Design a protein around this ligand. Structure first.
Ligand SMILES: [Cl-]
Ligand SMILES: [Cl-]
Ligand SMILES: [Cl-]
Ligand SMILES: [Cu+2]
Ligand SMILES: [Cu+2]
Lengths: 120, 111
């Protein structure tokens, strides 16, 4: 057999709001959207979004995404996402950092999930 | 830019035990292991595992994985996991789901 790809599942109390942010703001496309679950895609990456009732879940939900052209993606999103991450009143992203595992930045979405984007 | 691959982050109150399950029982390899975070890998798929203090998180954590040879993977795991536990294979793609010791539920779908 061969395991070929994986799809992280972000969580949210407001599923429709999460889909709108990932698509209308970050440029992912809607693969499918149901009231309690959805799938969004950009290039070879699909992210699912699932409904939850306890905010503790997205508050502890993470995902990692590998990217060719990290600075370009950061530039695009910097136009529409705040870089004041310590202000958790809304979505925001960090600056690019050089972590042991790679050059990356992270973005906290409106639901609270933290998705890290790392340069290939 | 191009988004090339994604890595789901499973959650666990016991990261080491989750690593033990995914590697010894499910046949993933250890990519790296720290007390509060770890990475396991099989073929092109890497799963990260992060520590949490609230069991509600893994009890609501999901991930999907695509596979060539779904029936072979099911047969391999049916020798080490109760049918942690896994569902039967059913048509939705064709898939089965597996709940790990930490509570995460990962679905495996046939390409
Ligand atoms: Cl984080
Ligand atoms: Cl063992
Ligand atoms: Cl489920
Ligand atoms: Cu944190
Ligand atoms: Cu369920």
């Amino acid at each position: 057999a061969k395991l070929t790809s994986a799809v992280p599942v972000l969580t949210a109390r407001d599923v429709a709001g999460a889909v709108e942010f990932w698509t209308d703001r970050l440029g992912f496309s809607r693969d499918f959207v149901e009231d309690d679950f959805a799938g969004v895609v950009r290039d070879d990456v699909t992210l699912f979004i699932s409904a939850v009732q306890d905010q503790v879940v997205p508050d502890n939900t993470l995902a990692w995404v590998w990217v060719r052209g990290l600075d370009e993606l950061y530039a695009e999103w910097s136009e529409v996402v705040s870089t004041n991450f310590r202000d958790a009143s809304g979505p925001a992203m960090t600056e690019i950092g050089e972590q042991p595992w790679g050059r990356e930045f992270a973005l906290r979405d409106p639901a609270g999930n933290c998705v890290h984007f790392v340069a290939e």
